[PDB]
Design a protein around this ligand. Sequence first.
Ligand code: JRL
Ligand code: MG
Ligand code: ZN
Length: 313
Amino acid sequence: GLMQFTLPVRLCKEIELFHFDIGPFENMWPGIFVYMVHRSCGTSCFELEKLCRFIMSVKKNYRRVPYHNWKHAVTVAHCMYAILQNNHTLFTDLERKGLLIACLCHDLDHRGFSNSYLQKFDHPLAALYSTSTMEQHHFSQTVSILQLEGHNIFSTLSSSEYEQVLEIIRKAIIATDLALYFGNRKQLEEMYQTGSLNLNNQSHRDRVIGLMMTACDLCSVTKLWPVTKLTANDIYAEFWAEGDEMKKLGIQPIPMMDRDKKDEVPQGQLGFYNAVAIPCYTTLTQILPPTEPLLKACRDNLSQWEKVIRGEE
Ligand SMILES: Cn1ncc(C(=O)N2CCC2)c1C(=O)Nc1ccn2cc(-c3ccccc3)nc2n1
Ligand SMILES: [Mg+2]
Ligand SMILES: [Zn+2]
C-alpha cells in the first residue's frame, strides 16, 4: 500500500508529456506502466502482486516482431495515460482502470500481419472472426490472461462493475481496427459540429473512447522527429515482410507493402498524415481541448515528411 514506484528525475518529468519515449531499457517498462496506473487510477486500483503477475503474462504473449511488440503496448498505454492526466474529471474510475489495461493488451499475440493477409492466407483466425480478425483475437487473449490463477486484477470489483470494465476493454480493443476509425471519426465530426455530442450518452462516450484508442495507437506520429522516423523503419519492416508473403501467395501487394517501392515512402506517409493522423488528432482536440499537443506534434512531423520529399532531408 505504502510502496510507490518512483522514476529518475528526467523520466518523472518527461513521462507527463505526450511526446515521451519510454526508452530502450525493456526492464524499466513494467515499472513505467505501474507508475502510470498508480498516478492515473490510484495505488489501491489493483493488488500490486496481481498487477505485476498480469503485466509479465501480457509481456510474454507479445511476440518478437519489429513493431507490434511489447514496446508498442507500453508506448500506447503511455499516450492514454497523458490523455487521462490532462482530462482529470472527464473519465469515471472504471474507465481509467479499463483503458490503461486495454492499451497494454490491445495487440496481444500480434504476428506482424494485417487482417487482409490473414483473410488471403485463409488463416484459422479469419474463419473464427470475419471482421476485426486480429482485434477479436487480442480481446480473446486479454480474457484468457485475466483467467490465469492469480491474474484477475479486477477481482475486487462487483459483478456489474466487472462486466462494465470488460465491456470498456472489449470496445476499446475492437476500435483499434483502423477499418472502423474512418466512420467513427465522421460520426464524431458531425455530432460535434451539429452540437448533438453528449458525454452522458453511453454510445457517444464509446465513440470518444474509440477515437482516443486510434490516437494512442498512432502516437508514433506525435513524437519528436527522430523517434517518428526510426519507428517508421519498424512499421515498414512488418509491411514489407507482409508484402513478401503476399508475393508467395502469388498476389502483388499494395505499394505500402512492396519493398521494391521504398522510394515512395515519404509521399505514402503524407497521404497517411492527411487521410488518417491529422483528422484523428483534429477531431480529438475539438472534443478534448487539452490533447492539442498531439495535433501540434503530428503537424510538425507532417512538415518533416514534406522536407524529406523536397530533398532538404
Ligand atoms: C506511421 N504509421 N503509424 C501507424 C500506421 C499504420 O498504418 N498502422 C500500423 C498498423 C497499421 C502507420 C503508417 O505508416 N500507415 C500507412 C498508411 C498508408 N500508407 C501508404 C504508404 C505507401 C508507402 C510507400 C509507397 C506507397 C504508399 N505508406 C503508408 N503507411
Ligand atoms: Mg492492432
Ligand atoms: Zn497497436
